[PDB]
């Protein structure tokens, strides 16, 4: 998980945990910017298509008052808006 470079090799368990958490935070920031602006990353170039590298959509698409929107929102796990929808 860590780099072989001596300056970047962790020296203690606390330091190793700090490095791992920093890497995870960088990954989370990358995911946040990806999902906040999917348009910059929609362009797919790889054959075969890789679904795991495409941005994720979390916003409800169905707006009309129907059961289908409310099911979509259950699938998106939006509690407060789901009770509003019901």
Chain residues in the site for other proteins (CB under 8 A): 1, 3-13, 16-20, 22-27, 29-31, 33-34, 37, 39-41, 43-55, 77
* In the complex, minimum distance from the CB of residue 73 to other proteins, in angstroms, rounded to a whole number: 13
* In the complex, minimum distance from the CB of residue 61 to other proteins, in angstroms, rounded to a whole number: 20
For the chain, first and last CA: distance in Å?
46
* In the complex, minimum distance from the CB of residue 70 to other proteins, in angstroms, rounded to a whole number: 15
Which of these, 56, 51, 86, lies nearest to 71 by C-alpha position?
86
Cα 83 from Cα 86, distance rounded (Å): 5
């Amino acid at each position: 998980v860590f780099q072989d470079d001596p300056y970047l090799m962790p020296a203690s368990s606390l330091e190793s945990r700090s490095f791992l958490l920093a890497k995870k935070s960088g990954e989370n920031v990358a995911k946040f910017i990806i999902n906040s602006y999917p348009k910059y990353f929609q362009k797919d170039i790889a054959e075969p298509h890789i679904p795991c590298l495409m941005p994720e959509y979390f916003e409800p698409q169905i707006k009309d008052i129907s059961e289908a929107a409310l099911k979509e929102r259950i699938e998106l796990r939006k509690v407060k808006a789901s009770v509003d929808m019901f």
